[PDB]
Amino acid sequence: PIVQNIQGQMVHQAISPRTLNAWVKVVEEKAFSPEVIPMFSALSEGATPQDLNTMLNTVGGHQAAMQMLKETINEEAAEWDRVHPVHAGPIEPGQMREPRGSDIAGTTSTLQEQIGWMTNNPPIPVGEIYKRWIILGLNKIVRMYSPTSILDIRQGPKEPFRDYVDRFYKTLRAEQASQEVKNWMTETLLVQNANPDCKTILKALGPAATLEEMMTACQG
Amino acid sequence: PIVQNIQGQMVHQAISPRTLNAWVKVVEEKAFSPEVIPMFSALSEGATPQDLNTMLNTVGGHQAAMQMLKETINEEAAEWDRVHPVHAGPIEPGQMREPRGSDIAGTTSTLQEQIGWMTNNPPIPVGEIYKRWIILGLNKIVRMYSPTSILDIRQGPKEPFRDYVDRFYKTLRAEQASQEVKNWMTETLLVQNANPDCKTILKALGPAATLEEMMTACQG
Amino acid sequence: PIVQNIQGQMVHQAISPRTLNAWVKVVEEKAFSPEVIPMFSALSEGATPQDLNTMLNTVGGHQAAMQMLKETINEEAAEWDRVHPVHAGPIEPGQMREPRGSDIAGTTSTLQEQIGWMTNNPPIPVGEIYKRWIILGLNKIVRMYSPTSILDIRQGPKEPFRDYVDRFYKTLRAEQASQEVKNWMTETLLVQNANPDCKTILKALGPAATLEEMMTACQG
Amino acid sequence: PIVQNIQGQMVHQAISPRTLNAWVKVVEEKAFSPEVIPMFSALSEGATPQDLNTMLNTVGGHQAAMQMLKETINEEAAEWDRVHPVHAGPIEPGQMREPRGSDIAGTTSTLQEQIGWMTNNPPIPVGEIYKRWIILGLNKIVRMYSPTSILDIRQGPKEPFRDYVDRFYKTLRAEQASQEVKNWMTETLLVQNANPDCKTILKALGPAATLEEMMTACQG
Amino acid sequence: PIVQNIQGQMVHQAISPRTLNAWVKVVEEKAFSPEVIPMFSALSEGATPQDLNTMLNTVGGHQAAMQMLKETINEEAAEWDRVHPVHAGPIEPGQMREPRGSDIAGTTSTLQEQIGWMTNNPPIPVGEIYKRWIILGLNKIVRMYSPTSILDIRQGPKEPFRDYVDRFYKTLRAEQASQEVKNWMTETLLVQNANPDCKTILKALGPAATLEEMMTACQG
Amino acid sequence: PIVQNIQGQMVHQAISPRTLNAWVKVVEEKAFSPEVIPMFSALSEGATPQDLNTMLNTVGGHQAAMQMLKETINEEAAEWDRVHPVHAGPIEPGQMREPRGSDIAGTTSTLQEQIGWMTNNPPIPVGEIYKRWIILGLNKIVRMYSPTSILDIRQGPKEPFRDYVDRFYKTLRAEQASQEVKNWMTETLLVQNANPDCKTILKALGPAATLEEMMTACQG
Q: Where in the numbering of this chain does the Retroviral nucleocapsid Gag protein p24 C-terminal domain appear (chains A, B, C, D, E, F) (predicted)?
């Protein structure tokens, strides 16, 4: 990634072997949890496109998901190249050329060019754009990987309300929806697909009640 | 997180994977207990709000408590923006914007803004307030996760006194009761809900019995 | 813990994750033994009172021993406040106030107070006093945690002599007493509860002999 | 590996034991996987040829693959020496001699020679050439180690479609071919060896459709 | 232990918890091999007597060996007090007092006195003498631990010569003898208790032969 | 061992327990293989002779190889003191004594003398010579530990070719044969001691077969 030395100039540090060891390990160990995506955001803070590509390719298995995310990367690069024109000519000092889709993807770029593009003034967030594309691809793969839909979860006769709401939130984290409508599901379906006793309890308590008090009422 | 060098000037540092690996493991290994709050408070000392958000997002399971702490953060931010109004419209040159309800948590604020806020002169303890809010949320959570109340704790006919008093102090530590009422009840409810023979022995020993005397007498 | 080193002494670093993780893991695995006393003393060499509080709060389980340690610390703090009264009236400017009985435990004090009290000229060893308090508490804990007394140790017909004396010395170390009677009790109890073969061997050797000759005598 | 940093660049540090241990573990545990080439490229980022030799010598087992790698490296070094002949006669003073074909592999060179070659002005990237040789050898190794060809892959009546396409893409990644034939062969081979139900589904969808719709079509 | 900072003055650094963790784990896991004492020498390089005392006390179990080493320490301290007189009077700056056996052992001394004694000119190797006493005690313990004597090992009819000589040297590392006589032992007992066929082979080859050629002849 | 600081001046550092534990695990884990000599050469790079002595003394088991390496060290020291006579009797002021046969290994020499020798101007590579001697000793050890000669390798009727060629190259690398004779025999013994059907198939290809062809043709 990129680090700043104590009272020194901006220098580029190599990839973290211990972090990569953890990243490969986490996927195998954790299977494919939704929390894995944040994991990538925390482990790849300020990482270069080459480091991101190495971290993606070093993963063993999930080749179908890798092909899907590569297709999404190609589509995003094509959209970027279509929305932003490309100009050619002499390169003036202090100003870099127009990055293309393949240059943002990092497949036809080099480490020195990436450093020059990320250390310019103003900086070009090529790494940030690639990381956003990667996390969007991971969100798509975790949406497709969801075994149970958001509208298919219902509280059973013997299933506790704690486990019910836990699974409901786990499916909501993996479902596809916008941020505004995201509250509508957890406000309506959470009480519309519960056990009838706690349904009546929450209806008598009030719909505007919060999760803590509604659970303390459903537990008692 | 934040480290202090021998020179005197501090810089930003990315989140180390070892701390989060331990944090994910400690939450899973220890489940939920009173000891998790201190570990959390000692492990995330001097960290940016984004690091705490990632730690609260990288946890696997128990999404109910995560939603509880998220709603607690939202309520605290609402109370903060209600009690602290923005009376100053324009911003002086060289000064950064005041942290609002959504900026104090790091939802719509980048890491550079948090760095500039925490490194100001004088510094703005946004991370400290966020840690206090998370500690209050965890207190509420461990109070909800109590298996039973303090009044229902009664020693059985053949159950030993060691595990009995252990469970008693365990369910008393997670209680939101004040120090005064806890010190008042620990002198009465411990002897009133004990083994009859031991209870009579402790009552005949005197009204100034301490912990070690009770442990030595109740086991004989 | 506080760090006294080269220029730049005005530094304070929190507890390292490796230390705290190791202490919680070792205490649970080793349960309670006389051995923990030196491990705790070595892990907390020159630590701040808040660090000791965090280390005492990180332990999970055994709430009775923790309550006994807390009440012993409170009693010793009350004794210290009784023997070292605080002076009334206004304090002199530039002179730090002496630590009170409750300030040693770190319950009503802050970080800057203990930092100024430890880095004062001359320094005030409040951390050493708190460590001695915790050591006395752990001594009382390991004394009350003794399952079998020292007099109920008798070697069986098939139990080895080495294992017998190992158990005997472990039980003797678990209990705290004056060494002047220990020198007599070890000699008047070791050579009395051995096997008949080892008993006649030590009788033919001599009571005033050393221990290594007794170990190498009845071996095998 | 080479360390290019602030003043004091003239420094050579050996390979860290942790990275070498991680390499040994990932070689022993996973044998050879299509993802080992990015692992080697990340763990050996900017290393001296001696470091590459030490990493290639610590491999456990699979002597045939190592011999294949060695002979490929020798052949490519011979080709480099043939295409880049060395100039005869005396060398100019102060100008470092060009590395020979055998000097790149580090079989007849020393540490100071390659240090001066990599730190010259302009630098000579012999380490990158050796890494290219090693990754080409690894590609040949993973192509030879292919247990089943790409045409002998047929999905059974009960095997899932996701695992089938995962195995297919894994076998395709294990083999190295031109980019202009792979996009045609995958489309002409995937929609033929699927389940009858999934075959009818994809026939109802369309040949020129994307892969995500094929994955989400016959799911469950 | 004692360390020297880069371009700094000689300062005493605190003890490392990981060292004690490795030390407690290795002794329990490896029981009492002769190499354990050597391991001790590497872990206690330049450590203060308090560090060695804590390391010995933190060991779980084996209180008999602890009592034996404490008795040896007391005997060595008494011998040092008898051979070196003790003087009293005013302490001049720059010169330390006469170290007593109780001060060499470190049971009745503090940290600052030992620091001043080890950082004086000329330095008084109190820690080195204590470490020598401790390794002598460990040698005595590992000699007592030896189940089979050096003269009781004989090669069986089906036992190979490799394991035979391995066990022979393992027992020789645990017997009580000086190096001058240890050479004669490892020269004559190796051929006196060997296999008769290999005995005749070595007699035909020659007694002055080294172990390598003797083993290569006995294998064939 | 020996580390290089950013300033430029190097200092002495004690052996880290992690490297010693890793070496012990590798020795315990893999017994003896031709691949452990590069592991030792890369793990103990730039270490004092005392560190190598401690590493060779802390190993548990296989004392025959330890005695072999000790005898080789003694023989090399004898050859050194025989070929390098001490012609200079007096020692110049400021100059250290010349390392003798017993001083080059560290038996009767302290660590300070070794530090002064390795930090001289010009430095005396005593550690490098000791490492070369240990490498030669380990070479002799792995040559002796060869199960059989190179001629006894014969592929059976049902034994596969992969494990056959793997064992062949293993015992060839463990052999003391020179680089020329190894390349001379690897073209003959591999084809003359194979499965008859495969043997004839490979002989029908020609005298210019490569390793990949031998692997792909024999398996058909």
A: 144-217
Letter for the amino acid at A197? D
Resolution in angstroms for this experimental structure?
Answer: 4.7
* Phi, psi angle pair for B11, to nearest 5°: -130, 170
What tokens does D133 get?
């040789």
Q: Which of F50, F52, F44 is nearest to F113 (CA)?
A: F50
Helix (H, G, I), strand (E, B), or coil: what is residue F130?
A: helix
From the list C22, C41, C46, which residue is nearest E21 (CB)? C22
Tokens, residue C169: 């010395």
CB contact under 8 A, B63 and A4: no
Residues in chain E with CB shorter than 8 Å from the CB of F144 are 212, 215-216
Given a contact cutoff of 8 angstroms between Cβ atoms, the answer to whether C117 and C126 are in contact is yes
- Measured between alpha carbons, how far is F212 from D143 in angstroms, rounded to an integer? 10
- F210 contacts chain D (CB < 8 A): yes
Verify A-E touch: 3 or more CB pairs within 8 A.
no
For chain B, the chains sharing at least 3 beta-carbon pairs closer than 8 angstroms are A, C
Contacts 24+ apart (CB under 8 A), D191-199: D193/D153, D193/D154, D193/D155, D193/D164, D194/D155, D194/D161, D194/D164, D194/D218, D195/D155, D195/D157, D195/D161, D198/D161
Token digits of residue A86: 């490309």
Q: Scanning the structure block, which residue is given the tokens 């914007």? A: B97
Q: Does residue A128 sit at the B interface (CB-CB below 8 Å)?
A: no
B6: closest CA among F108, C5, C138? C5
Domains of chain F: 2-144 (1.10.375.10), 161-218 (1.10.1200.30)
Tokens of F156: 């059976």
Spatial contact of C42 and E15, defined as CB atoms under 8 Å apart = yes
Q: Which of F187, F193, F189 is nearest to F213 (CA)?
A: F187
CB-CB under 8 Å, E42 with F58: yes
**Helix-strand-coil percent breakdown of chain A, rounded to 5?**
60, 5, 40
Residue A130 near residue A105 (C-beta atoms within 8 A): yes
Which residues, 6+ apart, have CB-to-CB distance to A173 below 8 Å?
A: A34, B63
The verdict on a CB contact (< 8 Å) between D64 and F33 is no
The answer to whether A25 contacts chain B (CB < 8 Å) is no
Q: DSSP state, A2?
A: E
Those residues with Cβ within 8 angstroms of residue E183's Cβ, 6 or more apart along the chain or in another chain? none
Contact D64 F215 (CB under 8 A): yes
B60 shares contact with chain A (CB less than 8 Å): yes
For C149-208, the DSSP string reads: -STT----SSS-HHHHHHHHHHHHHHS---HHHHHHHHHHHHTTSS-HHHHHHHHHH-TT
* Largest interatomic CA distance in chain D: 76
Q: What's the distance, Cα to Cα, between the start and end of chain C in Å? A: 50
Three-point CA angle E84, E86, E87, nearest 5°: 135
Eight-state DSSP code of residue D88: P
For F144, which of E166, E170, E216 is closest by C-beta distance?
E216
Instruction: Quote the CA–CA distance of D147 and A207 in Å, as a whole number.
Output: 61
Residue C17, preceding peptide bond in cis (omega within 30° of 0): no
C-alpha to C-alpha distance for C169 and C190, rounded to whole angstroms: 10
DSSP characters for F133-181? HHHHHHHHHHHHT-SS-STT----SS--HHHHHHHHHHHHHTS---HHH
Q: How far is CA E207 from the centre of its chain?
A: 32
SS3 F210: coil
Kindly state the DSSP code that residue A4 receives in the 8-state scheme: E
CB contacts < 8 A (B, C): 64
Q: How far apart are the first and last CA of chain A?
A: 51
